[PDB]
Amino acid sequence: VDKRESYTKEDLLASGRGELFGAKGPQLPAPNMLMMDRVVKMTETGGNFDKGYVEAELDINPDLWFFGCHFIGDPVMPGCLGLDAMWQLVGFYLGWLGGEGKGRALGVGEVKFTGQVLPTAKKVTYRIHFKRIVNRRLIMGLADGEVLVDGRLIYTASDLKVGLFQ
Amino acid sequence: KRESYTKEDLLASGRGELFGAKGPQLPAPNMLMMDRVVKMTETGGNFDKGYVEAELDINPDLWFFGCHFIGDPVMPGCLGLDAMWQLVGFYLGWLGGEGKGRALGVGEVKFTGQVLPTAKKVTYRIHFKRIVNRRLIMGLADGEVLVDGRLIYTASDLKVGLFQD
Amino acid sequence: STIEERVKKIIGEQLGVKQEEVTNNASFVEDLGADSLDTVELVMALEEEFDTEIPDEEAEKITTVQAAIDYINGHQA
Amino acid sequence: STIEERVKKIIGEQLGVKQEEVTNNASFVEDLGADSLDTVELVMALEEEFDTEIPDEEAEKITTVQAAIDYINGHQA
Ligand SMILES: *C(CCCCCCC)CS(O)(O)CCCNC(=O)CCNC(=O)[C@H](O)C(C)(C)COP(*)(=O)O
Ligand SMILES: *[C@@H](CCCCCCC)CS(O)(O)CCCNC(=O)CCNC(=O)[C@H](O)C(C)(C)COP(*)(=O)O
């Protein structure tokens, strides 16, 4: 795969169809599980451990499906979907490096939610700091993640683990 | 109070019509991740401080199977984790807690198997460790997710709170 | 170290401040910026550091650095 | 030889099998119930416990209990 350093929504929708990193590369979920609109930065080095960095964004609009049901009369972005974005981005990064296989989340260490995303927000930002990539029969990525809303840190996740499997 | 809840009761919960006007609400479809609560007790569970067991019927028509992923359907792990947060919060409401539910975090989550559309039923087991009744009401618990009797996910130190204003 | 300095450290990291901020008269919510989650977590962190259980009715009164110190020194120092 | 026993301890925990099953010439995949994930985590557990980094394809050759034992011996002395 010809690495680019950023991707548009159309690139991400192509990823969901299996048409961004070739058929053997991992796919992102399609909407409504896709939790990013764009990938704004991707590097092989950098990040807190100098072993890789990804940054992505999601535009916030009161018409997003999850505001209507979580909860009725009390809209908030589900924390689980922010966490999924982070798993999605780890898997995407494994694909970007050239890993082949189906993407699967394997787990996470500590997650802390300390603030919320309301429908009046502009933009959620995801930051992923890679710690290790294991290239074995299972390809696995290990990272820490952060979720910010309009510049304000609101979620953290230690030891996100995603793999690509045959 | 009841010790079990039907699909209709959980839909009532999402409209804020099951517990009090002031009790927490479950998410409505399509974020509601259970069809029923089978058992709820104040004792019991691995720590003898509370237990919840709930289920989700698996059908290939469920919305998430079509998009995650196209050509490779599997239940998102994040949604099983949300069921566990939903149940911890539901439990706090069941005890009479007032406020809006909010997930606060989790300690460690391991996914060791998957839910395919060919599966029949997912079972959630929540084992309460501690309830803190302060301005925030907080519940702490371990969770297990099983599919057709086999353990596939574990989560330690699920934290959920009920808050005011 | 002394009970006073271990309590201050926990308060510091829990609330995201360094010691010069953690003055004995400092109130967790009014002075140090804590929300309802931070205070619950802080008292639990105290239970763990000093291996003692604090009931909720007691925990509710621990609202300043000095009150935490006094509580720990009083049960059972 | 704290090594041989400590390694058997780690393998038993990681693969969630009994002490009895961790024989020296047992295969993680064939004999024990190890998948691709248990295997990665296994090796990473050996790295963390004994303080030694070993690239991915030094692993993928550690297939049995004897191999894990044998490998770490040389890297410990
Ligand atoms: C939906 C899932 C919650 C399941 C509960 C069901 C009970 C019926 C909503 S989310 O929890 O997923 C919201 C996203 C994650 N968490 C948050 O947004 C809250 C983060 N924490 C805070 O904002 C503060 O800690 C609060 C306001 C809760 C502190 O309260 P205090 O000052 O009174
Ligand atoms: C989709 C969202 C994840 C997006 C990340 C990838 C983007 C490209 C849904 S999940 O991944 O969350 C499904 C969650 C359940 N977890 C799994 O299904 C994988 C759990 N682990 C295993 O099943 C085993 O470890 C397996 C057998 C697959 C290991 O394989 P190995 O023997 O080679």
Whether C42 contacts C14, CB under 8 Å: yes
For every residue of C16-76, which 3-state class applies, written as one string? CCCHHHCCCCCECCCCCCCCHHHHHHHHHHHHHHCCCCCCHHHHCCCCEHHHHHHHHHHCC
DSSP symbols for A76-113: ---HHHHHHHHHHHHHHHHHHTT--SEEEEEEES-EEE
N-terminal to C-terminal alpha carbon distance within chain B: 27
Q: Is B68 a catalytic residue?
A: yes
Whether A106 contacts A94, CB under 8 Å: no
Q: Say which residues have a Cβ less than 8 Å from residue B10's Cβ, sequence separation at least 6.
A: B18, B26, B32, B34, B35, B36, B37
**CA B103 to CA B139: how far, in whole Å?**
10
**CA A12 to CA A27: how far, in whole Å?**
9
Tokens of D19: 């002490």
Tokens of A35: 């939790």
Whether B143 contacts B128, CB under 8 Å: no
Whether C40 contacts B140, CB under 8 Å: no
Bridge partners, A141 (sequence order): A133, A162
DSSP symbols for A34-78: ---SEEEEEESS-STTSS-EEEEEEE--TTSHHHHHTTTTS----
Whether A87 contacts B111, CB under 8 Å: no
Whether B43 contacts B76, CB under 8 Å: no
Count H helices and E strands in chain A, helices first.
3, 7
Q: Which atom of ligand 1 is nearest to the CA of B164?
A: 33
The experimental method, as deposited, was X-ray
Residue A45: other Cβ atoms inside 10 A: 10
Q: Which amino acid would we find at residue D44?
A: M
**CA B109 to CA A148: how far, in whole Å?**
22
Tokens of A157: 């996740």
B74 touches chain A (CB under 8 A): yes
C39 touches chain B (CB under 8 A): yes
Number of domains observed in the structure of chain C: 1
Q: Which amino acid would we find at residue B78?
A: C
Q: Spell out which residues of chain D touch residue A106, defining contact as CB-CB under 8 Å.
A: 37
Tokens of B135: 């301005």
**CA A131 to CA A144: how far, in whole Å?**
7
Residue reference for tokens 């087991």: B125
Instruction: Kindly report the backbone phi and psi dihedral angles of residue C47, in degrees, each rounded to the nearest multiple of 5, phi listed first.
Output: -50, -40
* Window B:87-116, CB contacts with A under 8 Å: 100-111, 114
**CA B87 to CA B18: how far, in whole Å?**
14
Q: Do A110 and B109 touch (CB under 8 A)?
A: no
Q: Say which residues have a Cβ less than 8 Å from residue D74's Cβ, sequence separation at least 6.
A: none
Q: Which fold has domain B1-165?
A: Thiol Ester Dehydrase; Chain A (3.10.129)
Whether B41 contacts B50, CB under 8 Å: yes
**Helix, strand, coil fractions of chain A, as percent rounded to 5:** 20, 35, 45
Three-state secondary-structure class, residue A127: strand
Count contacts between A and B (CB, < 8 Å): 115
For residue A79, give the nearest of D3, B104, C7 by alpha carbon.
B104
Residue D61: other Cβ atoms inside 10 A: 8
Which resolution in angstroms does this entry have? 1.9
N-terminal to C-terminal alpha carbon distance within chain D: 12
**CA D67 to CA D77: how far, in whole Å?**
16
Q: Which residue of B70, B79, B108 is in closest CB contact with A30?
A: B70
Q: Which amino acid would we find at residue C14?
A: Q
Whether A30 contacts B69, CB under 8 Å: yes
- Does residue D77's CB lie within 6 angstroms of at least one atom of ligand 2? no
The catalytically annotated residue of B22, B36, B49, B68 is B68
Is the bond leading into B30 cis (omega within 30 degrees of zero)?
yes
Q: Which amino acid would we find at residue C55?
A: P
Bridge partners, B56 (sequence order): B122
For residue A126, give the nearest of A78, A76, A55 by alpha carbon.
A55
For residue B162, give the nearest of B105, B100, B103 by alpha carbon.
B100
What b/e readout covers B20-32, taking b as 16+ CB neighbours within 10 angstroms? eeebbbbbbebbb
**CA C64 to CA C46: how far, in whole Å?**
13
**Helix, strand, coil fractions of chain B, as percent rounded to 5:** 20, 40, 45
What dihedral do alpha carbons B105, A142, A102, D34 form, nearest 10°?
Answer: -90
Chain length of chain D: 77
**CA D32 to CA D9: how far, in whole Å?**
14
**CA A37 to CA A53: how far, in whole Å?**
17
Three-state secondary-structure class, residue B135: coil
**CA A133 to CA A141: how far, in whole Å?**
5
Instruction: Kindly report the backbone phi and psi dihedral angles of residue A92, in degrees, each rounded to the nearest multiple of 5, phi listed first.
Output: -60, -45
Distance between alpha carbon C39 and the CA centroid of its chain, in Å? 8
Chain length of chain A: 166
Residue reference for tokens 């910010």: A148
DSSP symbols for chain D: -HHHHHHHHHHHHHTT--GGG--TT-BTTTTS---HHHHHHHHHHHHHHHT----TTTSSS--BHHHHHHHHHHHH-
Three-state secondary-structure class, residue A128: strand
Distance between alpha carbon C59 and the CA centroid of its chain, in Å? 10
For chain B, list the strands marked E by DSSP: 36-41, 51-57, 100-106, 108-111, 121-133, 137-147, 150-163
Whether A121 contacts A152, CB under 8 Å: no
CATH 3.10.129.10 holds for A1-166: yes
Mind telling me how many Å the CA of C19 is from chain B's nearest CA? 26
Tokens of D55: 């690239």
Helix ranges (H only) for B15-120 are: 63-67, 77-94
D23 touches chain A (CB under 8 A): no
- Using the 8-state DSSP alphabet, how is residue B160 labeled? E
Q: Which amino acid would we find at residue A37?
A: D
For residue A25, give the nearest of A77, A111, A99, A82 by alpha carbon.
A99
Q: Which residue of A106, A135, A163 is in closest CB contact with D56?
A: A135
Q: Say which residues have a Cβ less than 8 Å from residue A122's Cβ, sequence separation at least 6.
A: A59, A60, A150
D45 touches chain A (CB under 8 A): no
Instruction: Kindly report the backbone phi and psi dihedral angles of residue B69, in degrees, each rounded to the nearest multiple of 5, phi listed first.
Output: -115, 160
Residue reference for tokens 């296989």: A101
For residue A4, give the nearest of A26, A24, A23, A20 by alpha carbon.
A20
Residue A22: other Cβ atoms inside 10 A: 11
Count contacts between A and D (CB, < 8 Å): 26
For residue B17, give the nearest of A72, A107, C19 by alpha carbon.
A72
**CA C25 to CA D3: how far, in whole Å?**
53
Is the bond leading into C28 cis (omega within 30 degrees of zero)?
no
For residue C35, give the nearest of C21, C49, C15 by alpha carbon.
C15
Domain span at C39: 1-77
Pick among C37, C43, C54, C63 to test the B interface (most B CBs inside 10 A): C37
Is the bond leading into C73 cis (omega within 30 degrees of zero)?
no
- Does residue A92's CB lie within 6 angstroms of at least one atom of ligand 2? yes
Mind telling me how many Å the CA of B127 is from chain A's nearest CA? 18
Max Cα distance, chain D (Å):
31
Three-state secondary-structure class, residue B49: coil
How do the domains of chain B map onto residue ranges?
1-165
How far, in Å, from the CA of A156 to the mean position of ligand 2? 21
